[PDB]
Amino acid sequence: RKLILFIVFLALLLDNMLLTVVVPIIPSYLYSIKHNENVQVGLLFASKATVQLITNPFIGLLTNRIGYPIPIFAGFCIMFVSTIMFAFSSSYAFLLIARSLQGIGSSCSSVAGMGMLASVYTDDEERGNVMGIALGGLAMGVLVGPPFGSVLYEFVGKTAPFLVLAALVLLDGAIQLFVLQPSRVQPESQKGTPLTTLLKDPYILIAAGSICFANMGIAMLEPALPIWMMETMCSRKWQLGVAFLPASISYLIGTNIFGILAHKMGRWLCALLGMIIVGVSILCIPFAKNIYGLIAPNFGVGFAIGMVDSSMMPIMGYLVDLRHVSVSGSVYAIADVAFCMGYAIGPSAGGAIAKAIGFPWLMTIIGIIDILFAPLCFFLRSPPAKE
Ligand SMILES: NCCc1c[nH]c2ccc(O)cc12
């Protein structure tokens, strides 16, 4: 009963460590191998997000029809396959294929783990608060990602970070012996309202846009910042990956402090501050001309993204309880689609803008748009009811 929480937390951890061990390796590796590369790196990064966004409805169908453990085992297999593909392949196409597979793997793991965790814990009084461990699986994975993918990549080469990640994925899959079997036909029943009907509501879009933009900021920063750092003569030792470390250590505290303080000031008055602080603190990024000049803006970016996560995650459900037939899956689907839309559109537009007009202007434009988006949170003061 307890071990499912740890298993889903670890399966999110080993997915979102994989998601961010790529950012220091593949950009620099493709920069080196060719000695305008953004036109390819951006799409190589956006493939995972577009694949997960496409795949989510079908895995939802699979979970509704024939149960949760099957997609969990599928995701467990796909994560190891993608990791072993990263550890060995060199050509661009066979990195793109693995990043494509990682999208289906992330979809399976996230959706099925959320569903089965909700099923085991059932009622709100426990499950609703326990759900916040998803963010704790997010934060530590993102924290160990860049340092582990950079330091050992400097010390013992390309294959080491993915090799040691696979050494953990195999252990996690062996611990999953208790549930998953070669042959399992499993039951499930119908609940809730589908996303395609929920997003038809224009009011929920106002809340989804905040988290979408707050993640799109970092999703555009991710493909380009290593290239920008390489252009300004940065190294790998304590330099190439550690630049992302303050953002992670700040995210750890952002998901906790204002998560505790939410109700004390109004969650919309915290979402507004998170949005504005993201917009302001990504403007300071282009103007830093030294590695130690990037510590200050990242310590704000991570904190502000955590402040938006821990102040929008309950809200997407608080409204859905007031307007539509609600279930845990319908609550999580909004957040997952809002995450994936940003993580897909960000790199796709970045790989064009940063190459046609430049990276600092891309960050400035995103910051200004994020700042100007803030007044839209005025509407969440109180939503009116409906039939
Ligand atoms: N896809 C960007 C991953 C990433 C790198 N550094 C980060 C810092 C905080 C965060 O939430 C996420 C990240």
Side-chain angles (χ1 to χ4, degrees), residues 10 32 44 48 56 85 125 129 158 224 254 267 296-297 326 367 369:
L10 181 59
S32 179
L44 165 58
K48 178 271 201 184
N56 267 6
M85 191 146 278
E125 298 292 342
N129 297 299
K158 155 69 140 53
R267 266 178 167 147
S326 181
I369 289 172

Side-chain angles (χ1 to χ4, degrees), residues 85-352:
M85 191 146 278
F86 278 177
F88 290 176
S89 84
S90 41
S91 178
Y92 170 82
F94 298 103
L95 320 171
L96 183 103
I97 288 304
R99 280 288 283 183
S100 203
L101 289 196
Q102 190 189 4
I104 293 129
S106 191
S107 184
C108 291
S109 64
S110 185
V111 177
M114 281 305 317
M116 201 205 198
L117 195 163
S119 181
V120 171
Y121 277 80
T122 70
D123 212 357
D124 163 13
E125 298 292 342
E126 291 190 52
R127 182 256 297 159
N129 297 299
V130 167
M131 171 295 298
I133 277 280
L135 311 163
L138 217 46
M140 281 206 74
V142 158
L143 189 143
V144 202
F148 195 71
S150 311
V151 178
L152 295 186
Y153 145 77
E154 192 295 343
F155 262 74
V156 281
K158 155 69 140 53
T159 71
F162 300 107
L163 191 83
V164 189
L165 174 64
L168 297 179
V169 179
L170 287 181
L171 175 135
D172 192 13
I175 272 296
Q176 259 279 24
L177 255 163
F178 311 145
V179 190
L180 313 173
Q181 301 177 357
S183 302
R184 293 183 71 94
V185 180
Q186 311 284 248
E188 178 63 321
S189 71
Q190 310 148 29
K191 291 189 177 183
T193 304
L195 176 80
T196 56
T197 307
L198 165 143
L199 286 177
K200 199 172 181 182
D201 185 354
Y203 197 98
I204 299 166
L205 303 186
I206 313 303
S210 75
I211 192 52
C212 173
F213 287 126
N215 271 281
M216 188 140 65
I218 197 157
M220 274 191 159
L221 189 71
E222 170 196 45
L225 188 70
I227 292 173
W228 189 241
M229 261 165 78
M230 270 294 258
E231 290 275 300
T232 69
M233 331 319 176
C234 194
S235 194
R236 274 81 61 81
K237 69 196 75 171
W238 306 305
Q239 276 200 346
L240 186 51
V242 184
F244 282 107
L245 187 75
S248 271
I249 300 176
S250 68
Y251 184 83
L252 224 66
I253 278 174
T255 54
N256 299 31
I257 295 295
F258 263 109
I260 288 168
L261 282 158
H263 323 76
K264 284 74 170 182
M265 204 54 148
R267 266 178 167 147
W268 75 265
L269 248 172
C270 177
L272 174 147
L273 290 185
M275 253 332 295
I276 282 183
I277 290 175
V278 165
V280 167
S281 196
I282 71 170
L283 297 180
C284 289
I285 278 290
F287 306 134
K289 303 162 32 163
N290 183 276
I291 173 79
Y292 313 127
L294 288 176
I295 289 169
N298 283 357
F299 222 128
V301 172
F303 187 82
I305 288 180
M307 154 188 323
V308 177
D309 294 314
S310 297
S311 312
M312 225 61 181
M313 211 55 98
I315 296 288
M316 309 217 149
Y318 160 72
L319 295 71
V320 82
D321 289 355
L322 297 179
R323 289 187 157 208
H324 308 97
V325 152
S326 181
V327 80
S328 61
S330 303
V331 176
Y332 150 85
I334 307 159
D336 199 38
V337 158
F339 264 51
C340 284
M341 187 56 157
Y343 259 67
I345 272 283
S348 177

Side-chain angles (χ1 to χ4, degrees), residues 28-51:
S28 147
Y29 181 79
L30 293 183
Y31 194 108
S32 179
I33 197 193
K34 290 183 174 183
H35 287 83
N36 48 47
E37 302 87 347
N38 210 349
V39 69
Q40 287 172 335
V41 201
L43 301 183
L44 165 58
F45 270 77
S47 85
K48 178 271 201 184
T50 201
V51 161

